[PDB]
UniProtKB/Swiss-Prot annotation, chain B:
Consists of an N-terminal FERM domain linked via a short unstructured region to a large flexible C-terminal rod which contains 13 amphipathic helical bundles (R1-R13). The rod begins with a five-helix bundle (R1) followed by three four-helix bundles (R2-R4). These are followed by a series of eight five-helix bundles (R5-R7 and R9-R13) in which the N- and C-termini are positioned at opposite ends of the bundle, creating a linear chain. The four-helix bundle R8 does not disrupt the chain because it is inserted into a loop in the R7 five-helix bundle. The gene is TLN1. This is Talin-1. It comes from Gallus gallus. High molecular weight cytoskeletal protein concentrated at regions of cell-substratum contact and, in lymphocytes, at cell-cell contacts. Involved in connections of major cytoskeletal structures to the plasma membrane. It is found in: Cell projection, Ruffle membrane; Cytoplasm, Cytoskeleton; Cell surface; Cell junction, Focal adhesion. Residues 81-201 are annotated as: Interaction with LAYN. The chain holds residues 200 to 400 of 2541 of the full protein. Interacts with PIP5K1C and NRAP. Binds with high affinity to vinculin VCL and with low affinity to integrins. Interacts with APBB1IP; this inhibits VCL binding. Interacts with F-actin. Interacts with LAYN. Interacts with THSD1. Residues 1-201 form the FERM domain. Phosphorylated.
Length: 9, 201
């Protein structure tokens, strides 16, 4: 939640 | 994401981290109040994970486990949480690395210090002072701020003397008047100086 981010890059 | 894989040995890192952390926490490695809270911020990141405003508030920590003794009676908890906040989502390994590098970057790092007592000016009560000894100099450090106030090249030392309650330095031509302090570690200090001076030629 706004912290444990995820990215494709 | 990804790509940069961490191949650092976490076991070795933890060992370096623990030694650095313990020396700061027990006073062996004297640091300022600001630095102690910065270290404490990384410690929090390491033991608790990213700062959570909901839980990580004053009263959440046992300050004796995060700060040198002399800084516990101050408003350090507040400063500690701001430093904790700065770490953002930093990983535990990254935090340990930052902690060790910050400790190693300090001028006081790896320096042998002795807490002695100096009698001075218009003061009847002795004043605590950190006396540091390196392979290049003897330094007088403020016991509170941990800032270097005076430094003497080892090449300027003529002779020294130790008693069960003191240590004295004689700088010969350098200055008229010896430097004498109260300490129970006089011979330990003499031995270190002695060894360092033997090599200075």
């Amino acid at each position: 939640g706004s912290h444990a981010w995820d990215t494709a890059n | 994401s990804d790509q940069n894989v961490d191949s650092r040995d976490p076991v070795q890192l933890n060992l370096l981290y623990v030694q650095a952390r313990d020396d700061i926490l027990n006073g062996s490695h004297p640091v300022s109040f600001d630095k102690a809270c910065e270290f404490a911020g990384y410690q929090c990141q390491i033991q608790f994970g990213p700062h959570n405003e909901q839980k990580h508030k004053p009263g959440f920590l046992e300050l004796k486990d995060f700060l040198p003794k002399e800084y516990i009676k101050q408003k350090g908890e507040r400063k500690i949480f701001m430093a904790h906040k700065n770490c953002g989502n930093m990983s535990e390994i990254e935090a340990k690395v930052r902690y060790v590098k910050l400790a190693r970057s300090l001028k006081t790092y790896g320096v042998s210090f002795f807490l002695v007592k100096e009698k001075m000016k218009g003061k009847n009560k002795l004043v605590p002072r950190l006396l540091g000894i390196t392979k290049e100099c003897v330094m007088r450090v403020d016991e509170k701020t941990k800032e270097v106030i005076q430094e003497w090249s080892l090449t300027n030392i003529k002779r020294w003397a130790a008693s069960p309650k003191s240590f004295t330095l004689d700088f010969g031509d350098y200055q008229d008047g010896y430097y004498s302090v109260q300490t129970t570690e006089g011979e330990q200090i003499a031995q270190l100086i002695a060894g360092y001076i033997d090599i200075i030629l």
